[PDB]
Amino acid sequence: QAAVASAYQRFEPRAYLRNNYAPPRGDLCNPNGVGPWKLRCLAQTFATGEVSGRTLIDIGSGPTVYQLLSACSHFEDITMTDFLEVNRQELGRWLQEEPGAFNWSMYSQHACLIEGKGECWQDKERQLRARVKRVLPIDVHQPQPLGAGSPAPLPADALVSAFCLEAVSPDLASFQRALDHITTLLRPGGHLLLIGALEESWYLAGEARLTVVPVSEEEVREALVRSGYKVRDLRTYIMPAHLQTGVDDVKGVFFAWAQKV
């Protein structure tokens, strides 16, 4: 992981956001787009109402919040995390509504649209901003991901992770441990909403050029099982030609709803 942590030193938030959350990938008007698909996944899952609790931790958040727009309405205590201060500064820049904050409103609007509870998007961002108490550092490679004195309520009633594990591990085995490490932050019976890349080996972020470990849905399933989870749901989005730009070589996106037994 020496090489890994060494590559993310050049990782630029603004470029990453521009590469994955601005058009075309950041267009939500097209129903078949990858953004609507992800929001539908989270919305639908929480819509079952069978994923609930007090505290929630977002593993490997980076500069994005979209992954919590639906969840933020089922957990009062939300803990966001990331390995780079640079990302925690960008996140903060959005949370404290500072200047130069990324514009996630398209994603907020689409979440309100999908949930169908007549909620305006300003009110949703408001609620999300309120339930996010802290933004802490994390290293999914450490046996104890958050360290020791962490202000984060452990265990957590639920964990949310999108595009992290596979993007920070050099091999399957490394990805397999990384999963276990965060699985220690969840109480049994708890839930895991995991989103990740499929068969991707690299992606860019400004000056950074990161190496990803190419995982398949079958391997993701097998690792969840081989980690103490029951697969409640496992979905695959096959990346469409028009969303295959020069920013990476991702072939698809997966969503898994896993419960720690």
Ligand X SMILES: C[S@@+](CC[C@H](N)C(=O)[O-])C[C@H]1O[C@@H](n2cnc3c(N)ncnc32)[C@H](O)[C@@H]1O
Partner in contact with 221, chosen from ligand X, ligand HNT, none, beta carbon below 5 to 8 Å by kind: ligand HNT
Residue 153 near residue 79 (C-beta atoms within 8 A): yes
The single-letter code of the amino acid at 154 is: L
Q: How far apart are CA 24 and CA 21, in angstroms?
A: 8
The DSSP output letter for 242 is G
- Neighbouring CB atoms inside 10 A of 45's CB total 21
- Beta-carbon contacts of 173 under 8 Å, excluding residues fewer than 6 positions away, are none
Parallel, antiparallel, or unpaired: how do β-strands 252-260 and 186-198 relate?
A: antiparallel
> Closest distance between ligand HNT and the C-beta of residue 148, in Å?
29
Nearer to ligand X, 164 or 258 (CB): 164
- Break sites following residues in the chain (C–N > 2.5 A): none
Asked if residue 13 has a cis previous peptide bond (ω within 30° of 0), the answer is no
Nearer to ligand HNT, 134 or 141 (CB): 141
The residue written with tokens 């697969």 in the block is 231
Judged by CB under 6 A, the stretch of 104-112, 120-128, 136-144, 146-154 that binds ligand X is 136-144
Judged by CB under 6 A, the stretch of 66-74, 140-148, 181-189, 232-240 that binds ligand HNT is 232-240
Q: How many residues are listed for the chain in this entry?
A: 261
- Neighbouring CB atoms inside 10 A of 178's CB total 26
Q: At what angle do helices 105-115 and 34-47 cross, to 10 degrees?
A: 40
Size of the site for ligand X (CB under 6 A): 22
Nearer to ligand HNT, 14 or 134 (CB): 14
Please state the separation of Cα 58 from the chain's center in Å.
7
Judged by CB under 6 A, the stretch of 41-49, 73-81, 119-127, 229-237 that binds ligand HNT is 229-237
> Closest distance between ligand X and the C-beta of residue 90, in Å?
9
Q: Is 200 in the site for ligand HNT (CB under 6 A)?
A: yes
Both structure tokens of 26: 């950041």
- Tell me: is residue 237 an annotated ligand-binding position: no
197, 198, 215, 224: residue in contact with ligand HNT (rule CB under 6 A) = 197
Partner in contact with 168, chosen from ligand X, ligand HNT, none, beta carbon below 5 to 8 Å by kind: ligand X
Annotated binding site: 16, 21, 60-61, 66, 82, 87, 139-140, 162, 200, 248
* Site of interaction with ligand X (CB under 6 A): 5, 8, 11, 20, 60-62, 64, 67, 82-84, 87, 138-141, 162-164, 167-168
* Site of interaction with ligand HNT (CB under 6 A): 20, 25, 34-35, 163, 167, 197, 200, 203, 212, 221, 231-234, 248, 250, 253
Annotated binding site for octopamine: 200, 248
